[PDB]
Amino acid sequence: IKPGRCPKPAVQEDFDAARYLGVWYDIQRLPNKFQKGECATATYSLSPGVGFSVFNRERLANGTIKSVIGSAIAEDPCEPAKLQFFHENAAPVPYWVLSTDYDNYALVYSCINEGASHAAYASIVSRQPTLPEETIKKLQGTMSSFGVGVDTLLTTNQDAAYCSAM
Numbered sequence: 001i002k003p004g005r006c007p008k009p010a011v012q013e014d015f016d017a018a019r020y021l022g023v024w025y026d027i028q029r030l031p032n033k034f035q036k037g038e039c040a041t042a043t044y045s046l047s048p049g050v051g052f053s054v055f056n057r058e059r060l061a062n063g064t065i066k067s068v069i070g071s072a073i074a075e076d077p078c079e080p081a082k083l084q085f086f087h088e089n090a091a092p093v094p095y096w097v098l099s100t101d102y103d104n105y106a107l108v109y110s111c112i113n114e115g116a117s118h119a120a121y122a123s124i125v126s127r128q129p130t131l132p133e134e135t136i137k138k139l140q141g142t143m144s145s146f147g148v149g150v151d152t153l154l155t156t157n158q159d160a161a162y163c164s165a166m
């Protein structure tokens, strides 16, 4: 969908998927097919392998909320930050944890080589509906350092008015 093939950025070192569990609020995201809504959250829970179970939830414009259940598993237990996201009726897409503090923020990247083009996902997630605008900028610097159009990014709405039932 986007011209050019995938870059290979650096990922989180000594990534602990146990400290990555819990709820993560979406702060910024690259536009895509699937996330056509707001009030988006990801909840990661125990899974037998190297990874976690996935519950992604968002509220749509019409008010009804839509969730997906999935799995994120590391295929190389020695590289815990490079995981694969498996979901019902689809081929797995990558799930790379580029950077995280486990307690406040996380930067996740994903890219699929599509012939001469590529498809990509990117997400700034926080442990609260907001994240300090200074950390957003620092993470946008990392993203732009490897080709990510930080200017195509969409700020997810996490305002109580619209997300008044979560």
Ligand SMILES: C=CC1=C(C)/C(=C/c2[nH]c(/C=C3N=C(/C=C4\NC(=O)C(C)=C4C=C)C(C)=C\3CCC(=O)O)c(CCC(=O)O)c2C)NC1=O
Pocket (backbone or CB within 6 Å): 024, 025, 026, 029, 034, 035, 036, 037, 040, 041, 042, 056, 057, 058, 066, 067, 068, 085, 087, 093, 094, 095, 096, 108, 109, 110, 121, 122, 123, 125
């Ligand atoms: C690297 C980033 C990234 C990947 C690999 C990704 C994968 C991904 N997210 C999806 C849905 C979704 N994904 C999210 C949200 C997230 N999903 C996340 O991985 C993160 C970090 C959030 C934000 C907290 C939500 C809310 C849906 C449901 C979309 C719907 O209602 O159909 C779907 C398919 C939905 C369906 O089957 O209908 C895929 C393949 N999304 C991403 O943003």
